[PDB]
Amino acid sequence: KLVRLPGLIDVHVHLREPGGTHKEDFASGTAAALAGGITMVCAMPNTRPPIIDAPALALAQKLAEAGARCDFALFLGASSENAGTLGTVAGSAAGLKLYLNETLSELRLDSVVQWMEHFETWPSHLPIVAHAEQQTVAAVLMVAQLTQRSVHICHVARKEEILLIKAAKARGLPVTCEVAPHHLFLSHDDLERLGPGKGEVRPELGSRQDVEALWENMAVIDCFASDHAPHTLEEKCGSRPPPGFPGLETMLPLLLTAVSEGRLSLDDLLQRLHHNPRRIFHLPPQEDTYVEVDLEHEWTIPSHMPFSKAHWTPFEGQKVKGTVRRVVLRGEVAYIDGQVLVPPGYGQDVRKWPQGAVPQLP
Amino acid sequence: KLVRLPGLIDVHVHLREPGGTHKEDFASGTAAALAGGITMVCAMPNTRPPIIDAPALALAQKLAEAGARCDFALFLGASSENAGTLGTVAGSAAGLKLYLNETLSELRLDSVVQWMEHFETWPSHLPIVAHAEQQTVAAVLMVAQLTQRSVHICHVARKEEILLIKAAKARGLPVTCEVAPHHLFLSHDDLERLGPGKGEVRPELGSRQDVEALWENMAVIDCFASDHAPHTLEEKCGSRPPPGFPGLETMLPLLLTAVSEGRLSLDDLLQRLHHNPRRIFHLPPQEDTYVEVDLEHEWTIPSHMPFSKAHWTPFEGQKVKGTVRRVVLRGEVAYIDGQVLVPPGYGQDVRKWPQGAVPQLP
Ligand SMILES: O=C1C[C@@H](C(=O)O)NC(=O)N1
Ligand SMILES: O=C1C[C@@H](C(=O)O)NC(=O)N1
Ligand SMILES: [Zn+2]
Ligand SMILES: [Zn+2]
Ligand SMILES: [Zn+2]
Ligand SMILES: [Zn+2]
Ligand SMILES: [Zn+2]
Ligand SMILES: [Zn+2]
Ligand SMILES: [Zn+2]
Ligand SMILES: [Zn+2]
C-alpha cells in the first residue's frame, strides 16, 4: 500500500547550468529531483556566469524553461556590485542569496556593510537567504535586525548554529532555517570511509554531537533542503576537491527511513518539505501534483544514483526503508519506478504563474 | 490599485446549522465569509444537534454541501461518550474539537481523564483543537505531552495564555494557537460602550495589557481566526446573553488597517490567514482562487454588516482602512463590492478532495 504525499519542494539545489553542465544540467538535475519525489526546486545562482544581474537571470530562465522537467524558481545572487540594481527583476526570482563565507570571487562580499546594503535595497517583501556558518549566523541576524526584516539561514549544520537560531526564535526574531540530509545522516564518523576529497562539503560534516543536536532541536528546523551540489567523482577525488554532495535522489529515502524509525513523524517531514518551503518563499501550489511512496521497501544506497551527473553519493552503503514509486506533476506521470517520463522543458518557472508572485503593498 | 491575496482561510467559525438557523446558516455565514475575503471555513460542532457522532456529521455535511457558498471542512466535537467511536469518520472532519471550559451539556467533559481518552483514541495524525482558557491551556498541554502529540489552542486572549504558549514553544513542544480579532482590537475599555450583554464573549475581552501582550507576542500567534459566533441582537441584549461576536465580515478590514499602520506586515497577515491554517489543518489549495483588496479606502464600521444574520457588530464605529473588492473562488466570481454572486451550494467539503485528505502512514 502506497502513501500519497503532496509535491515536495527543495529550496536549495545547484543545477550547474549555465557553465558547469558536465556536473549536472537542468534536465539531469530535475530528473534527479523527480526520482527523489521533488516536484519543485529553487536553483542557486553560483553558476558560470553567476546569476548576479538581469542578463544572466534572463539566460538562466530560458535554459531552465527549456531543460527543466519539474517546476522551479531561480535565485539571484548578491555581489559586491549589484546592491540597488536588482529591483526590476527581484520579484521574478526565488529570492536573493548571500554567500557570506567561502564562495566564487563574483559572489564574495568583503564587508558587513555590503550585507547591510543588500538588506536595505532588496525589496523588503522578498526572500533573503544566507550561507552563514558559525558566528556568521549571529552576524547576519544582526544585520537583519538593523534593517528590520527577516532572513532564512541555509544548511544549518552545527549544535552552535541551531542553538543560536533557537535563542533568536525565543526572542521572537524573524528567522527561519533549513537543514540538509548529510548533516542529519553523516558525521565525522563517516570521514574515514568517505576520504578527504569526497568528504569535502561546506558546511563541513559535524560531530556526532552536532548531528544529535539537530535531531534534538527538530522543532527549530523549518525546512529540509538538499543543498544538492553535484561535482563529478574526478573532481571530488582530485587535487583541489570542490565542496558539496549530490542529494536530490537520496534525501527523501533517508528521511522516510527516519520516519519509519519514529525519529520524526510524517507530518514533521511534510511541514519541512512542503508547507514551510511554500510559506517562507511564497511558492505556489502545483495543481494535480503528488508523489506516491512505498514505505516498506528496504534497499541499500548504491555507489551512484541513476540520474545525477555527479555519478557518486556519500550515502553509499546506507540501508534505507522507503522509496519513490510514482510522481504526477500537473496531471502528467513524471516518474515511475526508475523511469522519468516527462521531457526536458516540461517544467515551468513558478514565479511567472499568477499565484506565484509574492504579494506586496502597492 | 488593488492587491491580490490568496484565498484566506478561517479555521474557527460557528455557522449554526443545524438548529440555530435564525442566528446564521451555511448560506448566510458563507456569504459573510466571502464578503470578508475568506474562501474556506472550518465550522465548529456545537450545533443543535451537536456534531458528536457519525449521523450528525452526515447531516451537517449535506446541509453544508447544499448551503455553503465557499469551501469548508466540519469539525467533530468531543463528548463524554464518544471517545473511541469516531475512528471511521475522523478523517472526513476538519479535526476534533474539545470544549474544556463552559459549553453545551453535550460537549461538556467532566474530567481530565476524558481529555486523555480523546487524545489517546483520536487518530494521531489528525488535528485536535481546544477551547482552553487560562490554566486550562497548561492542563491541556500536559495531556498532549502525556499522550505524545500536538494540540492547537483556540482564541488565545490573555497575556497569561500567550506567555505560557511562548514558554512551551521555547521548550520545543508541538503547540500552535490562534487569536481572534476582538482580542486584538477590543478590550475592557470598550465594555462601557458595548454594555454587558453585547460584551459577553468567551474568552472574555481582555485588559489593555492583555491586548498589548498579544501584539508584542505576534511571533507566537500561528493563525488568526474569527470565532465568528453569531447570535441575534435580541439574544445578546436579553436576560441570558449568549457569549460571542460575529466577525467574518470585519476580520480582514480590521487586520488590513493594522497592516497599513505598520503594526504587522502583509506577510505576517498572510501567514496567519492562509499558510499556517493550511499547514496545521492540512487544508488543500483552492485552484484559481484569490481575493482583491483596496488598501486605501477609509470607512467606518456600521451597526451591522450586510450578510451575517447576527445583524449587529461589536466593532461598530471603528475606523478601518482596507476593503474587500472582489473574490474569485475556483474560477467563478464569488463576490464584488457588496454582492455575493455564487449561490448556496457552490461550496464544497475540502476533505473530500484528493488533495484534502490528511496524509497518514498505512
Ligand atoms: O556553499 C557551498 C556551495 C556548494 C556548491 O558546490 O555550489 N557546495 C558546498 O559544499 N557548499
Ligand atoms: O466558546 C465559545 C463558543 C461561542 C458560540 O457562541 O458558539 N461563543 C463564544 O463567545 N465562545
Ligand atoms: Zn551554501
Ligand atoms: Zn539554502
Ligand atoms: Zn548551496
Ligand atoms: Zn504566500
Ligand atoms: Zn471557543
Ligand atoms: Zn479555534
Ligand atoms: Zn468558537
Ligand atoms: Zn498538508
Side-chain angles (χ1 to χ4, degrees), chain A residues 2-362, chain B residues 2-362:
Chain A
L2 301 188
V3 184
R4 173 177 169 141
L5 311 181
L8 306 182
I9 302 168
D10 190 337
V11 300
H12 193 140
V13 305
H14 297 267
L15 301 183
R16 306 299 190 206
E17 184 173 6
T21 60
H22 65 288
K23 299 171 179 283
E24 202 76 278
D25 61 17
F26 282 114
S28 65
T30 60
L34 290 167
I38 306 303
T39 56
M40 191 192 303
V41 295
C42 299
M44 285 300 172
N46 64 341
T47 52
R48 296 169 184 166
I51 312 308
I52 59 172
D53 55 43
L57 179 64
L59 172 64
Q61 282 169 339
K62 302 311 300 189
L63 296 173
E65 287 182 338
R69 303 170 188 269
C70 70
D71 299 327
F72 62 86
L74 305 182
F75 280 98
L76 277 156
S79 78
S80 66
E81 305 304 313
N82 66 5
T85 73
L86 303 174
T88 295
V89 298
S92 76
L96 181 68
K97 172 76 174 296
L98 274 63
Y99 283 91
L100 302 182
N101 300 111
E102 306 175 337
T103 182
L104 299 185
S105 63
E106 292 96 327
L107 298 155
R108 244 165 249 164
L109 302 184
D110 48 78
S111 170
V112 174
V113 177
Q114 290 167 327
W115 315 2
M116 293 193 57
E117 287 170 352
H118 277 292
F119 272 74
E120 288 159 354
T121 57
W122 181 251
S124 66
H125 65 290
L126 295 174
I128 297 182
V129 309
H131 180 129
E133 301 186 45
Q134 298 189 268
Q135 60 188 83
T136 313
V137 181
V140 76
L141 278 170
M142 189 68 254
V143 167
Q145 302 335 290
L146 288 172
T147 62
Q148 309 178 257
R149 68 153 289 151
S150 65
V151 64
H152 179 82
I153 309 300
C154 296
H155 43 50
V156 170
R158 296 172 170 87
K159 177 176 189 180
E160 168 183 19
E161 296 160 350
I162 202 69
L163 293 181
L164 180 66
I165 292 164
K166 184 179 172 71
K169 287 185 177 186
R171 293 283 297 168
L173 301 182
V175 56
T176 55
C177 69
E178 71 200 28
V179 172
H182 40 283
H183 294 125
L184 294 171
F185 296 106
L186 295 169
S187 74
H188 293 169
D189 291 351
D190 300 291
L191 284 174
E192 263 223 1
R193 172 183 62 84
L194 291 171
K198 281 166 140 185
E200 278 290 316
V201 56
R202 299 289 185 283
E204 67 183 15
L205 292 184
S207 68
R208 282 275 283 189
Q209 292 71 27
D210 288 317
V211 172
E212 283 169 6
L214 295 178
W215 283 99
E216 284 172 12
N217 291 285
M218 185 60 60
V220 183
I221 301 173
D222 303 278
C223 304
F224 299 132
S226 61
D227 195 19
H228 181 82
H231 300 287
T232 68
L233 187 66
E234 186 273 320
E235 292 169 330
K236 295 299 301 195
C237 294
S239 56
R240 238 77 230 205
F245 302 150
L248 279 162
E249 291 164 272
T250 50
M251 175 163 66
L252 182 62
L254 288 164
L255 292 163
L256 290 175
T257 304
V259 168
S260 79
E261 292 173 351
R263 303 181 72 182
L264 77 171
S265 67
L266 196 31
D267 180 58
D268 293 339
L269 176 58
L270 296 179
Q271 297 300 323
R272 291 164 177 77
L273 279 177
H274 179 76
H275 291 293
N276 292 332
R278 273 183 175 173
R279 80 192 189 84
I280 293 165
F281 295 93
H282 325 279
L283 298 168
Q286 297 174 284
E287 298 181 27
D288 205 9
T289 296
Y290 57 92
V291 179
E292 289 171 344
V293 301
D294 175 355
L295 299 180
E296 289 301 321
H297 184 244
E298 300 174 320
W299 54 287
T300 299
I301 294 179
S303 58
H304 66 269
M305 299 301 290
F307 292 104
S308 175
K309 293 187 191 190
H311 207 257
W312 77 282
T313 172
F315 302 100
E316 179 183 355
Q318 289 195 1
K319 293 195 274 181
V320 289
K321 190 173 167 172
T323 194
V324 176
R325 299 297 303 278
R326 194 167 79 117
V327 180
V328 171
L329 176 55
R330 290 181 289 95
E332 295 298 323
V333 178
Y335 176 81
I336 298 179
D337 294 334
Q339 164 86 57
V340 171
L341 294 167
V342 286
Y346 184 74
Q348 299 176 17
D349 184 353
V350 302
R351 280 281 188 251
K352 294 183 181 83
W353 299 352
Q355 58 275 34
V358 180
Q360 76 183 287
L361 297 179
Chain B
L2 301 188
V3 184
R4 173 177 169 141
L5 311 181
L8 306 182
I9 302 168
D10 190 337
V11 300
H12 193 140
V13 305
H14 297 267
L15 301 183
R16 306 299 190 206
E17 184 173 6
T21 60
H22 65 288
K23 299 171 179 283
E24 202 76 278
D25 61 17
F26 282 114
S28 65
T30 60
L34 290 167
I38 306 303
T39 56
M40 191 192 303
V41 295
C42 299
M44 285 300 172
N46 64 341
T47 52
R48 296 169 184 166
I51 312 308
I52 59 172
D53 55 43
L57 179 64
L59 172 64
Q61 282 169 339
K62 302 311 300 189
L63 296 173
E65 287 182 338
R69 303 170 188 269
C70 70
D71 299 327
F72 62 86
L74 305 182
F75 280 98
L76 277 156
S79 78
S80 66
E81 305 304 313
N82 66 5
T85 73
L86 303 174
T88 295
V89 298
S92 76
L96 181 68
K97 172 76 174 296
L98 274 63
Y99 283 91
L100 302 182
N101 300 111
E102 306 175 337
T103 182
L104 299 185
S105 63
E106 292 96 327
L107 298 155
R108 244 165 249 164
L109 302 184
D110 48 78
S111 170
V112 174
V113 177
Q114 290 167 327
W115 315 2
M116 293 193 57
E117 287 170 352
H118 277 292
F119 272 74
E120 288 159 354
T121 57
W122 181 251
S124 66
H125 65 290
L126 295 174
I128 297 182
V129 309
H131 180 129
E133 301 186 45
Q134 298 189 268
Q135 60 188 83
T136 313
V137 181
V140 76
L141 278 170
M142 189 68 254
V143 167
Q145 302 335 290
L146 288 172
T147 62
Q148 309 178 257
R149 68 153 289 151
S150 65
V151 64
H152 179 82
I153 309 300
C154 296
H155 43 50
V156 170
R158 296 172 170 87
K159 177 176 189 180
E160 168 183 19
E161 296 160 350
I162 202 69
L163 293 181
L164 180 66
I165 292 164
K166 184 179 172 71
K169 287 185 177 186
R171 293 283 297 168
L173 301 182
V175 56
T176 55
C177 69
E178 71 200 28
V179 172
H182 40 283
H183 294 125
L184 294 171
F185 296 106
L186 295 169
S187 74
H188 293 169
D189 291 351
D190 300 291
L191 284 174
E192 263 223 1
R193 172 183 62 84
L194 291 171
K198 281 166 140 185
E200 278 290 316
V201 56
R202 299 289 185 283
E204 67 183 15
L205 292 184
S207 68
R208 282 275 283 189
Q209 292 71 27
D210 288 317
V211 172
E212 283 169 6
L214 295 178
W215 283 99
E216 284 172 12
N217 291 285
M218 185 60 60
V220 183
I221 301 173
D222 303 278
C223 304
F224 299 132
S226 61
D227 195 19
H228 181 82
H231 300 287
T232 68
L233 187 66
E234 186 273 320
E235 292 169 330
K236 295 299 301 195
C237 294
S239 56
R240 238 77 230 205
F245 302 150
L248 279 162
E249 291 164 272
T250 50
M251 175 163 66
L252 182 62
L254 288 164
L255 292 163
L256 290 175
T257 304
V259 168
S260 79
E261 292 173 351
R263 303 181 72 182
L264 77 171
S265 67
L266 196 31
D267 180 58
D268 293 339
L269 176 58
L270 296 179
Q271 297 300 323
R272 291 164 177 77
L273 279 177
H274 179 76
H275 291 293
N276 292 332
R278 273 183 175 173
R279 80 192 189 84
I280 293 165
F281 295 93
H282 325 279
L283 298 168
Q286 297 174 284
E287 298 181 27
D288 205 9
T289 296
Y290 57 92
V291 179
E292 289 171 344
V293 301
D294 175 355
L295 299 180
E296 289 301 321
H297 184 244
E298 300 174 320
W299 54 287
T300 299
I301 294 179
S303 58
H304 66 269
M305 299 301 290
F307 292 104
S308 175
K309 293 187 191 190
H311 207 257
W312 77 282
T313 172
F315 302 100
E316 179 183 355
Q318 289 195 1
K319 293 195 274 181
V320 289
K321 190 173 167 172
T323 194
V324 176
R325 299 297 303 278
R326 194 167 79 117
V327 180
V328 171
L329 176 55
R330 290 181 289 95
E332 295 298 323
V333 178
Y335 176 81
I336 298 179
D337 294 334
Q339 164 86 57
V340 171
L341 294 167
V342 286
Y346 184 74
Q348 299 176 17
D349 184 353
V350 302
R351 280 281 188 251
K352 294 183 181 83
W353 299 352
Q355 58 275 34
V358 180
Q360 76 183 287
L361 297 179

